[PDB]
Design an enzyme around this catalytic site. Sequence first.
Site, PDB file in Angstrom:
ATOM      1  N   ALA C  64       8.518 -11.649 109.597  1.00  0.00           N
ATOM      2  CA  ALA C  64       8.232 -11.610 108.192  1.00  0.00           C
ATOM      3  C   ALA C  64       9.249 -10.466 107.513  1.00  0.00           C
ATOM      4  CB  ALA C  64       6.798 -11.217 107.690  1.00  0.00           C
ATOM      5  N   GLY C 109       6.704 -13.117 113.197  1.00  0.00           N
ATOM      6  CA  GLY C 109       6.841 -14.628 113.007  1.00  0.00           C
ATOM      7  C   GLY C 109       8.064 -15.166 113.840  1.00  0.00           C
ATOM      8  N   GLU C 112       6.644 -16.238 117.234  1.00  0.00           N
ATOM      9  CA  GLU C 112       6.172 -17.386 116.739  1.00  0.00           C
ATOM     10  C   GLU C 112       6.759 -18.451 116.475  1.00  0.00           C
ATOM     11  OE1 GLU C 112       3.563 -15.006 113.913  1.00  0.00           O
ATOM     12  OE2 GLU C 112       1.760 -15.272 114.962  1.00  0.00           O
TER      13      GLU C 112
END
Lengths: 259, 259, 258
Positions: C64, C109, C112
């Site tokens: 992010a 992220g 991920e």
Amino acid sequence: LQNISVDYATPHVVKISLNRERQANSLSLALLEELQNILTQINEEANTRVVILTGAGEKAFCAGADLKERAGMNEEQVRHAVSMIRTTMEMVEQLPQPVIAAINGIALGGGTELSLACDFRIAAESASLGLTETTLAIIPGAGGTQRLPRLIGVGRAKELIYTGRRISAQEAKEYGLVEFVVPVHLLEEKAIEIAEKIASNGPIAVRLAKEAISNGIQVDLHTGLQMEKQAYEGVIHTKDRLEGLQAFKEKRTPMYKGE
Amino acid sequence: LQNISVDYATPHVVKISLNRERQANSLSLALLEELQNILTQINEEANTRVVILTGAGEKAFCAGADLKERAGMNEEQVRHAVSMIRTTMEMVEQLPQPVIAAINGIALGGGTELSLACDFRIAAESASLGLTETTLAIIPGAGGTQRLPRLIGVGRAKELIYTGRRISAQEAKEYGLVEFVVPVHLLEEKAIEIAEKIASNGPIAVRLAKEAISNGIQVDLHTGLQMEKQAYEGVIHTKDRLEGLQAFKEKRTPMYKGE
Amino acid sequence: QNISVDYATPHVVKISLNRERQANSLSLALLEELQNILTQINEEANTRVVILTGAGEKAFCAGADLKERAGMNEEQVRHAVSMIRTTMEMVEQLPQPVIAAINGIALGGGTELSLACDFRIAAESASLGLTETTLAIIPGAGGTQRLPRLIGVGRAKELIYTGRRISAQEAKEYGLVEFVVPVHLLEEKAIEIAEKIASNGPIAVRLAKEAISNGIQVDLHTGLQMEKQAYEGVIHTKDRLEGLQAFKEKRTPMYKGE
Ligand SMILES: [Ca+2]
């Protein structure tokens, strides 16, 4: 008889060998029928404690579904043949006894699928494995897409199935596809040794353990724990459990009888 | 407490030690009673952020069920004893805090089961593990048939359970059964330093992570993602999240308070 | 444009996150175009494999965007968080395999995102982590779910509870990344593997992805029934016949997705 050989020379252990060396031990309809018949018989053998599955010769464990035969099949026959292969895999996995795959050479496509249907696998250093189906524009149709990721994780299973690449026994060990790798001429000996160790344990307990693990791993942990609880009930009223404790008390090797 | 030791020397960290060295730290009903009582207390301790579970001495983490006590038990007694062990494992697993197993020696049967109930495991180089149950004509009855394949895969779990063989700490590490291996003389400081790191992270966040991972892994990915989503709502409004942001901006260590 | 899209070889599209100055972080703008590109690729027959990577040698994706989040309340965090989650789902549900080429740091992220890809190949110097608990939050775009599924519950717990970042070599040991190669060879090895996949039957590869991705979420018996249905999708194809013919003729098969 013709496409498979059986060996009961080792007490409590049965050795099944795929015997189509000229065709790289590929799975023909005739062979599948013979294998189904043998599995049906073993299923009812209380004295059989462990099964070893291997291929004849030093080149192939199983090259997969027979492609000469597949090439001459119409769609309907292809469906019947794939059904026969799937069902055989289920019969191997659902046998009461532990089944050990002794991988003596190439185990490709259906051959890798066959090894996955066994409880665990031992491979010769010279063996090679892989699910090569996508290279032929088909997919593993005998559990390869399901049993492979369950054993080795989705990531590895995907790269192997998408690429359709062949891997060495050492690579297979690194990825967790084969549990043991040993020199080529020591494969049958190591498989028999492991089998005999399993055969020396409580036969009723080993069978319940297979059921508990195989069924319980398919569901949530809480439910799996409850299945294990019911499985354990199965060893409570056995003479073998009492022998285990007596041998502990007498400080000696226990001798189980499967009762 | 006569069969276990509880030490809160290290802030936010509690170390529970099985304390029956003469008996190889085997699980007697009396020890299980004490362990359940302390687990109930820790379950309600907001100041406790991490738990370490270990054995006294340098020879045994836990030799499993107390077989001296088990010998001659009648049917009702056996069911109650196995129930006591399995219930204790569930309580360890369900503590809100992460639980680290520090395996200082042999961990057999119930001892391996106890280490599987912990979030992760650190083993002494000299430790040995295994689910030896089938060699006694029983099966793992406190989650071994369920937690082992979930951690290291079905194939490896099956060969270990069927053979009932003992494996070294090194082998355990190779199979993914233990996450760290250190010399026995350094086991305690290694467990404390990992516990201290986890204790310095946001406790609401760590607790929610344990819940999301442990429950989410039991179901399909889609549902698991929805559980994570709700868990994330539990951290976004916290004062600790704000402290995390301010600490990062000010390039200093955050001081989380569980709020 | 915060992303570039180019055909590296026939049938292989390379998507590069291009925000080097901000560690290829996931801004709303980047997320929007990434979603747009994925929506387009879903409908393409030419694309057989996707390679996802980051520009430069420092970062794959730092997660992010920090400067964009700096000015965000609880309400704005949700839309941003929602868009990241959604993007992950689009990658895993894309018909074609997606390969993460991890060229540097992967955090939050970004880690991920790598987990949402079918498999991962990392440069020797790359690193991965879910450091969320060090900041008193948890992974919010599938990290707590995709990580244990790939590397087992024990290691996923250790990494998430501690929040530690690990090298590519450690990641390889745990099975978090499937391949590790020297930095200067990351692009060419990702392309080599993608070319191999692109040479296989496209209908079969797509059906294999669905069978594996969906079947692994349920019990074995049901998963086997899903595989059975997926196999019906290759039986009547011309590619299947071409495969058997190319194998007999001992030549390269020419698949056309039929
Ligand atoms: Ca499941």
